[PDB]
């Protein structure tokens, strides 16, 4: 309650305000470029998934477990971006374990690994790093997909969770299914296509995985 | 009677455009697409793709790898990792790369690395034709 | 099945190799697309 | 000129929450690197 | 009192120097993370940091008026934009000696008349370009 | 005073507690496992040892023993919430069943190899038996 304490406390906040004010413009400048490149990638991402849309494919009741993928960055100060994804990641596993499967979780982004480490340390299969400092590219999705197949773990089902840009002031959390299993792909509705083979379908699922990963990051 | 979309991870060439036919150098031989072709799903190989417009002109592009999909209707989605035009290429550097890749075959020791070298020489020999 | 298959090579690996080979042949003026590709920005940290 | 003008390092002079929060982060970050540096010193000296 | 106590020659250069140094102060906070900015802001930062280095001076060594005018003239025209900031002082030191040793009659006119005429401007334009080309770091 | 007037036995176990608390304070306040987690795991234990009741001072050797138990790491496994009960029960047991050991430390004024050998066995046995 002396004069010196008041002076020091005023002089600290005077600097904090200017630091935040200068940090706002950089995020606006980055958001402009981030918005610019979304449109060319949206059509590619939608075009990748047309086949699964036209011919409905439903997974059966098997026990090969899932492969849940969550996407985030390594930086904070972004409101509740990471918490929303980490909320649904732990919600799905309860339903999955109700049936009983050897589910594993793979997360790209350090914050996702940090938040859920305490209660789901064993289910972690592999994690990535160095995300968000520079804009993502297709090569990163290629590297992730390449490193994902070499794992000895095999799955019949899987899903990927991400935040979808809706407006400059709002966003929506959603997930998309993966039917990359060859056996479930070979169903009645696929009989219309009449130049297929096992090798061709294996390569086709291989490519669809990288396409979905790139679309989610962008 | 067609909706053609030749997209890339970077830019877009066509979006729902209507053309008479498209010729694709896919795997397991060449291909020809017109009217209500039978459904198919095939990956590509390094080669040249030509698209015949309704007016009659033919546009050409070079594709490295990707996927092809012709659905029940006359909707075709051709998504390629690479999409380039010859006007920004050098034939001389192509011949030099091929010349080095030739000796790279004997330089190789193990069959997997030589398989990678064979993919290299396959790509180099494919592109130098045109 | 081709020579690349049954040789320890995947379709993604083959696509990477062919894309790199195509990008090499470009003219030096247009070689700024290597900046756009820049596929190496993600590190890998294993469980142990 | 009449008002209160701040300077450099005023955040760590008041000794509030932000000063100690600032100090602990530097302490941790530079506590992490010394292990790698010592391990590389031992490996270098053992090698030669 | 202001500009009523300046010679005609100093007034022309100091008028532009004043505005160029006034613009730099309101964007100096952005200097820490300036990479993610447009070109217009980075140009103000670049010119301001060049102009700051010229105002440094030694001790017990006052200068003359025409030498100050000659030094500032190169600064305000953009002839020092490409140089790295670490080498501004050495360039000033060398340029003053070169102009003093040979080009004395030019300084005589600036000292006498007190204003920069057209032909003197034309001569200075060639002098600075020649020396800058010959500096070779 | 620079600890010019202090018993020899107390210096051995207090000079090492100074460093533990000094290093604990500089990091463990943020309003990895190799260094940081261990550091505050030891520091939270060390803080709880210093609390004390009212109208009940202690003799020097009992303080030496209770600090000797903490500093060596014999209590890095128990949850911090239960440390005080361990202190009380261990002090009562040591006072009753080992009256000859305290006299050695009081008379000698310093610890010895035989005393150090005895204390580890006593501490480990009582820790094993004391789980309630």
From Swiss-Prot, chain D:
Give the residue ranges for region: Disordered. 1-19
Record-level Gene Ontology MF annotations: angiostatin binding; ATPase binding; ATPase inhibitor activity; calmodulin binding; identical protein binding; mitochondrial proton-transporting ATP synthase complex binding
Q: Where in the cell is it found?
A: Mitochondrion
Could you tell me the Gene Ontology terms of the biological process aspect for this record? Answer: erythrocyte differentiation; heme biosynthetic process; mitochondrial depolarization; negative regulation of endothelial cell proliferation; negative regulation of hydrolase activity; negative regulation of mitochondrial ATP synthesis coupled proton transport; positive regulation of mitochondrial outer membrane permeabilization involved in apoptotic signaling pathway; positive regulation of proteolysis involved in protein catabolic process
* Keyword tags: Coiled coil, Mitochondrion, Transit peptide
Q: Where is this region: N-terminal inhibitory region?
A: 1-23
Per the record, the domain comment is:
Forms an alpha-helical dimer with monomers associated via an antiparallel alpha-helical coiled coil composed of residues 74-106, leaving each N-terminal inhibitory region (residues 26-52) accessible for interaction with an F1 catalytic domain. The inhibitory N-terminal region (residues 26-52) binds the alpha(ADP-bound)-beta(ADP-bound) (ATP5F1A-ATP5F1B) interface of F1-ATPase, and also contact the central gamma subunit (ATP5F1C).
Q: Which family does it belong to?
A: Belongs to the ATPase inhibitor family.
Quaternary assembly: Homodimer; represents the active form and is present at a pH value below 6.5. Homotetramer; represents the inactive form and is present at a pH value above 7.0.
What this chain does, per the entry, is described as:
Endogenous F(1)F(o)-ATPase inhibitor limiting ATP depletion when the mitochondrial membrane potential falls below a threshold and the F(1)F(o)-ATP synthase starts hydrolyzing ATP to pump protons out of the mitochondrial matrix. Required to avoid the consumption of cellular ATP when the F(1)F(o)-ATP synthase enzyme acts as an ATP hydrolase. Indirectly acts as a regulator of heme synthesis in erythroid tissues: regulates heme synthesis by modulating the mitochondrial pH and redox potential, allowing FECH to efficiently catalyze the incorporation of iron into protoporphyrin IX to produce heme.
This protein is called ATPase inhibitor, mitochondrial
First and last residue shown, out of the full length, are 30 to 77 of 108
């Amino acid at each position: 309650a002396t004069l010196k304490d008041i002076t020091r406390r005023l002089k600290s906040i005077k600097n904090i305000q200017k630091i935040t004010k200068s940090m706002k413009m950089v995020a606006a400048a980055k958001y402009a470029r981030a918005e610019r490149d979304l449109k060319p990638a949206r059509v590619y991402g939608i075009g990748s998934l047309a086949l699964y849309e036209k011919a409905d494919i439903k997974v059966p009741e098997d026990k090969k477990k899932h492969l849940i993928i969550g996407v985030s960055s390594d930086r904070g100060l972004c409101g509740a971006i990471h918490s929303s994804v980490a909320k649904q990641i732990k919600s799905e596993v309860a339903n999955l374990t109700a049936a009983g499967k050897e589910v594993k979780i793979v997360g790209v982004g350090d914050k996702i690994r940090g938040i859920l480490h305490r209660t789901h340390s064993d289910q972690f299969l592999v994690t990535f790093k160095e995300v968000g400092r520079k804009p993502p590219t297709f090569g990163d999705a290629s590297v992730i997909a390449l490193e994902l197949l070499n794992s000895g773990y095999e799955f019949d089902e899987g899903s990927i969770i991400f935040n979808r840009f809706r407006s400059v002031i709002s966003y929506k959390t959603e997930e998309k299914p993966i039917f990359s299993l060859d056996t479930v792909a070979s169903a009645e509705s696929m009989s219309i296509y009449d130049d297929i083979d096992a090798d061709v379908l294996r390569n086709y699922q291989e490519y669809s995985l990288a396409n979905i990963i790139y679309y989610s990051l962008k | 009677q067609m909706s053609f979309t030749f997209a890339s991870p970077t830019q877009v060439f066509f979006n729902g455009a209507n053309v008479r036919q498209v010729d694709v150098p896919t795997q397991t031989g060449a291909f020809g697409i017109l009217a209500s072709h039978v459904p198919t799903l095939q990956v590509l190989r390094p080669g040249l793709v030509v698209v015949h417009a309704e007016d009659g002109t033919t546009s050409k592009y070079f594709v490295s790898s990707g996927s092809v999909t012709v659905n029940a209707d006359s909707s075709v989605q051709l998504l390629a990792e690479e999409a380039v035009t010859l006007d920004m290429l050098d034939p001389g550097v192509a011949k030099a790369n091929l010349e080095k890749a030739q000796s790279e075959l004997l330089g190789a020791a193990d069959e997997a690395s030589r398989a990678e070298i064979q993919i290299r020489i396959e790509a180099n020999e494919a592109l130098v034709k045109a | 099945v081709a020579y690349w298959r049954q040789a320890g090579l995947s379709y993604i690996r083959y696509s990477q190799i062919c894309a790199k080979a195509v990008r090499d042949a470009l003219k030096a003026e247009f070689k700024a697309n290597a900046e756009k590709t820049s596929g190496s920005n993600v590190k890998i940290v294993k469980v142990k | 000129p009449e008002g209160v003008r701040s300077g450099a390092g005023a955040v760590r002079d008041a000794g509030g929450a932000f000063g100690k929060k600032e100090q602990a982060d530097e302490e941790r970050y530079f506590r992490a690197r010394a292990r790698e540096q010592l391990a590389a010193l031992k490996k270098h000296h053992e090698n030669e | 009192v202001g500009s009523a106590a300046q010679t005609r020659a100093m007034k022309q250069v100091a008028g532009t120097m004043k505005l160029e140094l006034a613009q730099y102060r309101e964007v100096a906070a952005f200097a820490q993370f300036g990479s993610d900015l447009d070109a217009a802001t980075q140009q103000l930062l670049s010119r301001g940091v060049r102009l700051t280095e010229l105002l440094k001076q030694g001790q017990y060594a006052p200068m003359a008026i025409e030498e100050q005018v000659a030094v500032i003239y190169a600064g305000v025209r953009g002839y020092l934009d490409k140089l790295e900031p670490s080498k501004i002082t050495k360039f000033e030191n060398a340029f003053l000696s070169h102009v003093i040793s040979q080009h004395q009659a030019l300084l005589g006119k600036i000292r006498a008349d007190g204003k920069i005429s057209e032909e003197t401007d034309a001569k200075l334009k060639e002098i600075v370009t020649n020396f800058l080309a010959g500096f070779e770091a």
